[PDB]
Amino acid sequence: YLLARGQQIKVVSQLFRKCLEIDTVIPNMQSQASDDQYEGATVIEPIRGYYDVPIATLDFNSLYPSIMMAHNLCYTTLCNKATVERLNLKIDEDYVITPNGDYFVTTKRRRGILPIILDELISARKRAKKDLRDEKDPFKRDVLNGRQLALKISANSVYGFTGATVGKLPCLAISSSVTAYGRTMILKTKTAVQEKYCIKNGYKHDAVVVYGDTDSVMVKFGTTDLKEAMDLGTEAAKYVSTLFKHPINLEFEKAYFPYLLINKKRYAGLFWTNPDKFDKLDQKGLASVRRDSCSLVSIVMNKVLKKILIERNVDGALAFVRETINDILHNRVDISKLIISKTLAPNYTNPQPHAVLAERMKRREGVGPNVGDRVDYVIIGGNDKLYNRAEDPLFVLENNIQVDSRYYLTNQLQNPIISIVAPIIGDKQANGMFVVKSIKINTGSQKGGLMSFIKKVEACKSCKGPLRKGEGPLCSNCLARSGELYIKALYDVRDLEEKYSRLWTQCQRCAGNLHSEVLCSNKNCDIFYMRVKVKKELQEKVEQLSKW
Amino acid sequence: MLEAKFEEASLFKRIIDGFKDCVQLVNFQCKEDGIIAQAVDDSRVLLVSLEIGVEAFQEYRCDHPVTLGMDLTSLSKILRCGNNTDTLTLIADNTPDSIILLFEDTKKDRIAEYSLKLMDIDADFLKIEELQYDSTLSLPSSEFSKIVRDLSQLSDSINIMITKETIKFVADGDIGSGSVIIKPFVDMEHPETSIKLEMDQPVDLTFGAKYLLDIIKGSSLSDRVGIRLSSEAPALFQFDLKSGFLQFFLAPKF
Amino acid sequence: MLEAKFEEASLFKRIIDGFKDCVQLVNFQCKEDGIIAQAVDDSRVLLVSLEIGVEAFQEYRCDHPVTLGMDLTSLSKILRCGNNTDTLTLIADNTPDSIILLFEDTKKDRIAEYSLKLDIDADFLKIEELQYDSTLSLPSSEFSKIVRDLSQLSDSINIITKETIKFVADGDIGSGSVIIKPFVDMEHPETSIKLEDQPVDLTFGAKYLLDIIKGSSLSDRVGIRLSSEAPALFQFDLKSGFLQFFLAPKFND
Amino acid sequence: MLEAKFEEASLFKRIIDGFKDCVQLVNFQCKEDGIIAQAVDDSRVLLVSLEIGVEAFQEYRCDHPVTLGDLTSLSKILRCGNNTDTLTLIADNTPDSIILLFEDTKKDRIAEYSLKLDIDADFLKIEELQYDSTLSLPSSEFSKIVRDLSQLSDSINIITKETIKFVADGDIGSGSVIIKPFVDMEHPETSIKLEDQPVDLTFGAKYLLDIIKGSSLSDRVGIRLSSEAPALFQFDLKSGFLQFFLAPKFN
DNA sequence: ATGACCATGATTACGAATTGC
DNA sequence: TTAAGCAATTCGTAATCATGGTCAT
Ligand SMILES: Cc1cn([C@H]2CC[C@@H](COP(=O)(O)OP(=O)(O)OP(=O)(O)O)O2)c(=O)[nH]c1=O
Ligand code: SF4
Ligand SMILES: [Mg+2]
Ligand SMILES: [Mg+2]
Ligand SMILES: [Zn+2]
């Protein structure tokens, strides 16, 4: 069942078991047609900017399961006004009302079964996290993290199933009640941590809730010190948990010394769980940790955030961005780093690039990616709509068709880099460095409908003077630079031949064989898409050096 | 030092707007006999090639072949800032970092000195491998533009049938079809309305309308267009100038 | 075959200029005396009726009655390909599956043949009102002006008192009232305005009025007939026929 | 009761269309002499002041001084006015709306419109200052120059040695246009005026693009520049003027 | 001469993808 | 017969609407 069935069958089995052990029968409620959406959470406004002050982070321990098991929320505790009036139940002792308006009964009347299921799931997650705590290997650390992450999905899948209209026993009352409770709880903890930690009570600064993501509140205490910020965050989380029901508990999880809040549900910073060394560099929602963006953007954003947060030198970051722009414009970026992957869908109303690509591959090759497969492509240059400009990276590598470098500069790399460097250097200074001051039109080995039977008049060098009737790589006007252009060409050829040798010898070492031919189709190797590019470029540069 | 003083800015404005959309970055080669610039679109099926001889200009002080990395959008923005009574002059120093454009009005008035930055497009200078075309037809440019427009309104693939001395356009779309059959016309009153077909070879070729929609934009410079067609060689659309041409090279889709 | 040749290509264009915006699909029923076609909007508030006689043709031959229904947006594309010196000619065979439009000149042999695929299974033609309580006539450009002026202030326009044409519209930003009286001393047989029984007071929908006034291209004089609790008649005169619009009023109490 | 009778219906139309884009809510303070109206821009950088005299109306009663507090609604109503029409403003005592009578020479065509009028105008104290430079040039020339130089940059640099120089330095390049006063042509309307101290200010392009929309009331536009005060852009009327106060950019 | 009509930016809407709780 | 939830951003393409350039008048 774990491979051909979703998360509903697990909660169904748990519910049936707990019911059988409690003398209860689950009705066969005919599933309603569908629904649009009910009211979820209330994500706080993200005060954007660059924050060098340590921002503590306080989040809830399994917010929705804690809310469920804290208020006796279940199917078997769901009363209404008529029921409480007929039974004459006292308020606040026998029955309670949720912020959504629904009625439930306290644990004094009947213990639910969703609380028991959630107790089981959180007691499993506790040991799954303890095992990660007592573990050293980073790969095994990630494995135990994935194991823990799958035990908090099911604990949240309980609430999801109670709120899932498509599926058996859809009780939207309980899902709406837990969402209302969560919203009110984050609002109350924001108010409390802004009230207690201020000037009047005897603190240095005014604590401000910088950002909130429905369970967390990134309070900024103002103290530039980091250890003091961690201690204050711990004290604040403890005081807040003091003001809630037993299963609920706020915990100080992390601190962000350099904090860059890009937008809503999008930020980055340094993970400080210890006041002596940062753990990692987070990237929430940014185009680097996404999958519908070429890996070049990911690498560039990683390096830029490393230079800005870890090393704190914006000048080097801007220089690297300029170098990357120059590489993009001059076709100095490998095809492997310009590959965008998108998950195919069954039906498409608005045509998409990967859908049309898969259709063209089926029409051309003989078989294409079915639904659910991640189709990868690059954006070739053209005039028509973008969905008509997308090609298999192997087809591009074979046919040598040019890549739309301006597209990758403006549509892929411009916006994320701008959004991450603007809070530091301003909007205009950040956008100025994205002007196209240089271009390299390849127009090479593209023999096709028109790119065939065309000449290259071989204009002069360093001046492009068409009056090159006199033979030689230079015209009589700028002949005084005949000792520098040769140096440039020769050093280009040197770099290219060194790289070519390294790549092909490396391919032979990988193939294990030396006396045999290496015909490798592995397109997931970084050196793939690069050996052929370097071979072509070295061929052209050597043919250019042969003019002297 | 290049100093190309024109006679009227509208000439150069139309020259640029004729192909500012298909291509966007060109290399203008100001040599010792005028200006010449060729480029190819990103689809690599359209090749624009412009030649303005020194006769079209009024003054030409360029003594050393210089190159200008023109971005057509910025240059069109600059040219839109010109009047219809100005003698636009393009000036450039020895090593050009920027180009100067002066729309000095004939009557003593406000001179308009704009300094447009230049780039280095680092592209190759191409040239068509010539061949005796199968049919070199001449046709009034306005009629050709109207034909392309109303036909492309239907479908996205226009076909040309040059047979038995009657130029024929056909287009088969989803909503229907459209077939224009113009006979070879000749008259003494209107020299522009002149169509003289060549029976050298019958030509049945189909081009994408997405490129003819850009070809027909340079229809204001030349009152008549010369279309050279060949079943193997790529078709040519020549818009003749006062001392040059704005000829496009298009290849039938296949 | 079906041979219907218009005197000028620019006639069919203006004829369809009224349909294109409001009418989605229409089945043209050809006869031996001319062409007629009707349709109703998807909301069933406005009814269009086309009547084109032979007198607006240089030659007509429709021996057998024909019935073809197509799209106006696609047909308008075909009609826009017509020069001001060409002659339109509808061409359809027996039981047509597609219509053929033909443009020809008179000094240079230029044949422009366009095909157009054509059926909604609906040929409901119903007209009931033949007597209205008031009849008026005014320039087509003047009425459209008042209509588009009043539509800016509200979503409805109320049009009739003794010997006066009143146009009133009340909305959020304010109100607007235009009162036009028939007598004019201009002595021009076109910009004149006539009015001929019982007071009429009915409010219509602006959007429908905007779609109706777009028929001002067919002629230079539109007649408006009003009748309480009856769809008004918005007719545009034509040399051999007319294009009349039947817009139903709104319940006001 | 306030009852104005515009000489031409197109007059008030051009008057409102010259500034209906940079401001949304204005108060028309109508008095015995005429109507005064001023308001700040939505971004609070552009100040406009409207002045109309009794000399531009065929009949102007204005019994009591009343304040007329949406430029969009006024423009939508004024759009109905045709050429052969005499727009008549009508305001009662303490009004909540306003009648705009579009009468015609032919008394068989009458069109009246009512427009619902609360604006808390932060009334500023405008005062005639002694500006460093006082020039005047044709309105079509200035509008053309601004439309030209605004494409190159968002900021425009404007007089040294009795000669103005419009310069705009952007990213795609820079543009320069020289300016010399002259009255050589018999017609003066195409003449350039200029009068004390060198001045070099820089204004945002967008506000200049909104101001040049006032090139529909007069064929000339006067410019008064001061290094320590916002500029003065005024278009002359037969019975008043419509002036603009633009705050320059930072140095 | 006056808007007419075609062409060209702003603005809105929604599909599609992915990630954040 | 079977499928956890919602909130949020970003990008592409179309539809619609304001506004200017040029033409029959
Ligand atoms: C990830 C995820 C989360 N939710 C909801 C449910 C409540 C909130 C809290 O989620 P969170 O990942 O931060 O972790 P959390 O459990 O709250 O806390 P701890 O790691 O125990 O401290 O988000 C969900 O419905 N489906 C999901 O897949
Ligand atoms: S490209 Fe990769 S898989 Fe192929 S030979 Fe080189 S290293 Fe091995
Ligand atoms: Mg949490
Ligand atoms: Mg969270
Ligand atoms: Zn040289």
Residue numbers in the entry:
A (entry chain A): 550 to 1097
B (entry chain F): 1 to 254
C (entry chain E): 1 to 118, 120 to 160, 162 to 198, 200 to 256
D (entry chain G): 1 to 69, 71 to 118, 120 to 160, 162 to 198, 200 to 255
Q: What's written in the study?
A:
We introduced two mutations, D321S and E323S, into the proofreading 3′-5′ exonuclease active site of Pol3 to prevent degradation of the T/P DNA. The yeast Pol δ-PCNA-DNA-ddTTP structure is frozen at a stage at which the incoming ddTTP forms a Watson–Crick base pair with the template strand but is not incorporated into the primer because the last primer nucleotide is the dideoxyribonucleotide ddG. There are three conserved acidic residues (D608, D762, and D764) in the palm domain, two of which coordinate the two Mg2+ ions (residues D608 and D764) that in turn interact with the phosphodiester bonds of the incoming ddTTP. Surprisingly, Pol3 is the only subunit of Pol δ that binds PCNA, using a nonconsensus PIP site that binds only one PCNA protomer of the trimeric ring. The CysA element contains a nonconsensus PIP motif (997-GGLMSFI-1003) that is substantially distinct from the consensus PIP motif, as well as a zinc finger motif (amino acids 1,009 to 1,030) with its four cysteine residues (C1009, C1012, C1024, and C1027) coordinating the zinc ion (Zn2+). Interestingly, the regulatory subunits, Pol31 and Pol32, are oriented laterally with respect to the Pol3-PCNA-DNA axis and do not interact with DNA. Most interestingly, in the presence of Pol δ, the DNA is held at a nearly perpendicular angle (84°) to the plane of PCNA, and there appears to be no distortion of the B-form DNA.
The structure of the eukaryotic chromosomal replicase, DNA polymerase (Pol) δ, was determined in complex with its cognate proliferating cell nuclear antigen (PCNA) sliding clamp on primed DNA. Pol δ performs lagging strand synthesis by extending primers generated by Pol α primase every 100 to 200 nt. In fact, Pol δ has little activity in the absence of PCNA, which stimulates Pol δ activity by a factor of 30 (16). Pol3 harbors the catalytic Pol and proofreading 3′-5′ exonuclease, and the regulatory subunits are Pol31 (i.e., the B subunit) and Pol32.
